[PDB]
């Protein structure tokens, strides 16, 4: 668990490697219906969520996945009034969509109250986003919940993780294009490109075979392996440009939002990937 | 060092983080007049060069940060015919130099010829930058070769325990000096996500000297935090940093067989997260 002060992240994804964390207080460490539960206050990043064994998110650095996995689909969008939000316990991914002024209802899809429970506590930060008027919180399995929806949201974001695996079968993608409407988008987490370049490949190729538009961008962030993470954005309008925000902001807005990753140059360069990634994909 | 099938990286200059990589075979370890040497194959990123207990090179992705140190100051330049490389005893940055039909001639400083001679043996893919006929290497400590030098060179590259003269302030001035009059720099720069208070300060103190002084960065797994910068000073006015004047085609890419580099890549690489664009630039 803790070794000698320090937690140490290891998965079969990533093989070889391992990043620690020095830890300063165990916290917490249960396990709920569905998953293992560990929040430890780290030496140098704040406070920090682990699910099975893998970092999910720190105080110090959970701000750039939160801010792009939310504002890649929002600002692609030219009025996103509803929006779903599939997984996120933590709070922070709700805590960016509801800045948004378009935005009069979020849906939240999230399997575990155990980690809405234990984030509320550990997390604030994050949590905060439970405050918003706009929620609806829904408790259940995504991959169920998107079944019962149809022509019913302009955005979709999947914050996945064990439990996740639901989320990972090829028809997700289809359920979540048939609860879209017509010119709605979807973000997803999507994959590492320094370790897992031949399923982003595949991921693409398959999202292609379904909807008009698709792309793959990425943020930096020093604790998910390899330092950084991808997403995978799919529209079902075939004008959609996602490398090109359809909604700017105006510094006066980034200001406003409390911004700290995203900026509308941001939005731009995520999609400009290091050539040995273009090749592959393109 | 090696724990349990393990190398762990620490550093007080990123506390409470390590990146471990596992451990498939010793390969050599030690002592030159100047550092302690330890060379390893790893499990997943080939073999792996370790100076003073730093990960300062792996095969499987040193090409992001040889390629970037190169062609970001090169392609910044209109007709670059002489160049000075500090450091880079694996040879790799000089690989990446010479790929260039304008570079006549290449100085390369390397203060420890025993680091030179552990790549030419271990890193075969980055030492074969030596079989270049147009390198003079020179073997000494780059601060005081700095000093030799007026006028001289049209890119000077500082590819950086030993490397502490290279921290001394006079070598900003030192590197100015030895430039011609339009020429242009690049040195290692900080990681913006652990060190931003300390960019902040060299950009200031640059832009004290330099009329266009700019910063960038790209990623790299096996640094910490998994990504680097890259400090750029032109004494030229006119000097864009973040449009290349020297544009690749895709030809030239292909035919340089770069794997990270190209000419968008060159410009999204000055594009910064909100926080870092903030510091830098408010
Ligand atoms: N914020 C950074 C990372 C997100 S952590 C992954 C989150 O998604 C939830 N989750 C996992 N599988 C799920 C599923 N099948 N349906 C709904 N929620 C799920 C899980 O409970 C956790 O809250
Ligand atoms: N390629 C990725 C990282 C480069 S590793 C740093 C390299 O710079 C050399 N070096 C260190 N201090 C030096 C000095 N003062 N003068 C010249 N060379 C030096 C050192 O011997 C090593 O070869």
Not at 239 to 249: G, K, M, W
Request: negative net charge; aromatic residues 10%; contains cysteine.
């Amino acid at each position: 668990a803790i070794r000698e002060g320090w937690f140490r992240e290891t998965c079969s994804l990533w093989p070889g490697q391992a990043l620690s964390l020095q830890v300063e207080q165990l916290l917490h460490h249960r396990r709920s219906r569905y998953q293992d539960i560990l929040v430890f206050r780290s030496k140098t990043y704040g406070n920090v969520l682990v699910l099975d064994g893998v970092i999910q998110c720190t105080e110090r650095d959970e701000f750039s996945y939160q801010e792009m996995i939310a504002n890649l689909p929002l600002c692609s969008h030219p009025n996103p009034r509803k929006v779903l939000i599939i997984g996120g316990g933590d709070g922070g991914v709700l805590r960016e969509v509801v800045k948004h002024p378009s935005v009069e209802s979020v849906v939240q899809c999230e399997i575990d109250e155990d980690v809405i429970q234990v984030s509320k506590k550990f997390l604030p930060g994050m949590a905060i986003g439970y405050s918003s008027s706009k929620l609806t919180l829904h408790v259940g399995d995504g991959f169920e919940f998107m079944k019962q929806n149809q022509d019913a949201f302009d955005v979709i974001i999947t914050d996945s993780s064990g439990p996740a695996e639901s989320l990972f079968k090829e028809s997700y993608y289809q359920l979540m294009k048939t609860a879209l409407k017509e010119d709605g988008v979807l973000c997803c987490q999507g994959e590492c490109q320094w370790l897992h370049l031949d399923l982003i490949k595949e991921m693409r190729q398959f999202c292609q075979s379904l909807f008009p538009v698709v792309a793959y961008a990425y943020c930096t962030i020093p604790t998910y392996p390899s330092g950084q993470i991808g997403f995978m954005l799919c529209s079902k309008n075939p004008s959609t440009n996602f490398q090109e925000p359809v909604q700017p902001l105006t510094q006066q807005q980034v200001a406003q939002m409390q911004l700290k990753y995203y900026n509308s140059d941001v939005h731009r360069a995520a999609f400009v990937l290091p050539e040995f990634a273009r090749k592959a994909l393109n």
